[PDB]
Design a protein around this ligand. Structure first.
Ligand SMILES: CNc1cc(Nc2cccn(-c3ccccn3)c2=O)nc2c(C(=O)N[C@@H]3CC[C@H]3OC)cnn12
Length: 264
C-alpha cells in the first residue's frame, strides 16, 4: 500500500553476462525494451516474503527520488517467486574495485571531486529526510573516468539493495565499518553521515577499507569499545572524516557543513 514503482514485463528484459553479487542478489548486464536500453538486472535470491518486501521498498524509494548523482531504477520484474530490480548500467562499474585496480595513479583532486558528488547526492536525501543506509565504495558507480587531461570524474550512487532493516546481525557486522554503530543492535539520515565518513576513508585508502581484514567478533568489539577509525594523513580531511565517524549520531555534521568543508 505504501510503495510505488514500475512493474517491468519479463518479455521486455534480456539477461546477458554476470557482473557480480550484492546482498542476497546476482547482478547481470541486460537490455530493457522501451529502443533497447543497456541496464543491470539485480536478481533476488530465493527469499522469505520480508526480504522480497525490503527489495520492493528500495525500488519504491529510488523510483520517487531524482538526483544527477543517484542511479536510476527502471522498475521490478516479477516471475512468480523470482524478483528482478532493473537499474542503471553505469559504464566503469563500482568505485572500490576501480580504485584497487588503479592504485598509485588516482590523484587527491580526483578523489575530492568524487567526495563532492557523493556529498551532493546525500545532501539531497538529507533534505528529503530519506535514508540510503548502504553508502560504500561498492555502491558508488563510475560513469566517467575523469583521468585524461581536462576531464573530471562523474559518479552515481547505486540503489542500496535489500533494506538494512531486513538483514541479519551477521550481515550488519560484515558491513562494519560502513555500518553506523547505532545500526548494529536507528533508521535516521544520521547513519548516511557515518557511511559517508567510512566511504571517504575507503576512497583515500584506494578501495582498501579499515577493519575489512578483521573477524566478525573483532569488528563488533571495535564498535562496542567505541574505538576511533584511522584519520587520513591530510588533516583538513581528517577533521571531516572524524566528525562523520562520531559514535553519537546527533554530533555528526549536516551535509551543508560537509559540502561547505569539501568545497575549499
Ligand atoms: C559496468 N556496469 C556495472 C558493473 C557492476 N559490476 C559489479 C556489480 C557487483 C559486484 N561487482 C564485483 C565483482 C567482483 C568483485 C567485486 N565487485 C561488480 O563488478 N555493477 C553495476 C551496477 C550496479 O548497480 N552495481 C551495484 C554495486 C552493488 C551492485 O548491486 C548489488 C550498475 N552498473 N554496473
Amino acid at each position: 500500500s505504501q510503495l510505488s514503482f514500475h512493474r517491468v514485463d519479463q518479455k521486455e528484459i534480456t539477461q546477458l553476462s554476470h557482473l557480480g553479487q550484492g546482498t542476497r542478489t546476482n547482478v547481470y548486464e541486460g537490455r530493457l525494451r522501451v529502443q533497447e536500453l543497456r541496464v543491470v538486472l539485480k536478481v533476488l535470491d530465493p527469499s522469505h516474503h520480508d526480504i522480497a518486501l525490503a527489495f520492493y521498498e528500495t525500488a519504491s524509494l529510488m523510483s520517487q527520488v531524482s538526483h544527477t548523482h543517484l542511479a536510476f531504477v527502471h522498475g521490478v520484474c516479477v516471475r512468480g517467486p523470482e524478483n528482478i530490480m532493473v537499474t542503471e548500467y553505469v559504464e566503469h562499474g563500482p568505485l572500490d574495485v576501480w580504485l584497487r585496480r588503479e592504485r598509485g595513479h588516482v590523484p587527491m583532486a580526483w578523489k575530492m571531486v568524487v567526495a563532492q558528488q557523493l556529498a551532493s547526492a546525500l545532501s539531497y536525501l538529507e533534505n528529503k529526510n530519506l535514508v540510503h543506509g548502504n553508502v560504500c565504495g561498492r555502491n558508488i558507480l563510475l560513469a566517467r573516468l575523469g583521468l585524461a587531461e581536462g576531464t573530471s570524474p562523474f559518479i552515481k550512487l547505486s540503489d542500496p539493495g535489500v533494506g538494512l532493516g531486513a538483514l541479519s546481525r551477521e550481515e550488519r557486522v560484515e558491513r562494519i565499518p560502513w555500518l553506523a554503530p547505532e545500526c548494529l543492535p536507528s533508521l535516521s539520515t544520521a547513519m548516511d553521515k557515518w557511511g559517508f565518513g567510512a566511504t571517504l576513508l575507503e576512497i583515500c585508502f584506494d578501495g582498501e577499507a579499515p577493519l575489512q581484514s578483521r573477524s566478525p567478533s573483532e569488528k563488533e568489539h571495535f564498535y562496542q569499545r567505541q574505538h576511533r577509525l584511522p584519520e587520513p594523513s591530510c588533516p583538513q580531511l581528517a577533521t571531516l572524516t572524524s566528525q562523520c565517524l562520531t559514535y553519537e549520531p546527533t554530533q555528526r555534521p549536516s551535509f551543508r557543513t560537509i559540502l561547505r568543508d569539501l568545497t575549499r
